[PDB]
Design a protein around this ligand. Sequence first.
Ligand SMILES: N=C(N)NC(=O)c1nc(-c2cc3c(F)cccc3o2)c(N2CCCCCC2)nc1N
Length: 245
Amino acid sequence: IIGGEFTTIENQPWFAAIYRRHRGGSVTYVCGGSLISPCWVISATHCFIDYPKKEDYIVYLGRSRLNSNTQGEMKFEVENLILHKDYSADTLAHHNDIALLKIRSKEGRCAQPSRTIQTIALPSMYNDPQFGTSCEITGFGKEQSTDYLYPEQLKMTVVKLISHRECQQPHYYGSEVTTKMLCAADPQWKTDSCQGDSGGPLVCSLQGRMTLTGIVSWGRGCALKDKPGVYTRVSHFLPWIRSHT
Ligand SMILES: N=C(N)NC(=O)c1nc(-c2cc3c(F)cccc3o2)c(N2CCCCCC2)nc1N
């Protein structure tokens, strides 16, 4: 997250931290995700496509820090890694960038909701907020494009939804953006998602309800003028989600 503010898991208790084990046993951070039910985390396919083996991954819920444990956190293995059959990647864009992880603990349990662990509602179908609505993004991704490290503390920021017609401009992304994607950015291009934020939540208040409107997917650079963050439009994938859960 470029700009924005530090936060803790209580302010985004559906946030899932996804890591991968290496050969030799080192564990590194991969991507964010969102808990949509006790046993299911939703994320981005591009996070896993190069290492598509479920046994390589670890999921934490209730975690506010990257490389130190948070009190009350839960750790899960991945019982099921479901990538979207229609995924593709062009130079920049990723299409159908959506993935489901079924989580199971070593004791065989799903998520127990607590103060630090809660589910996020999915939107009703084809129902998103109007352009210019302020939504929030959360993640452990880079604080600056030039950074070598990820932040140790969880971050969040606010971005405003951009219209398809506007994001369609050649100055913006041309035809790289489809109706299955959403664009969002700061009016000053001052704050944004970045590398390491992929798979995490774009949350909007719709109908008085905090709703998983998007999943961090791609962008050109981070917090660059005319280059918004691009998000998987969750409201266009409900059958896929419903069928696979
Ligand atoms: N909001 C947005 N402008 N960009 C995003 O959301 C974003 N950016 C990036 C991204 C671009 C980029 C860059 F030009 C210089 C330094 C760091 C960068 O990080 C990114 N990367 C992970 C995945 C593919 C591989 C590229 C890296 N993933 C993203 N989701």
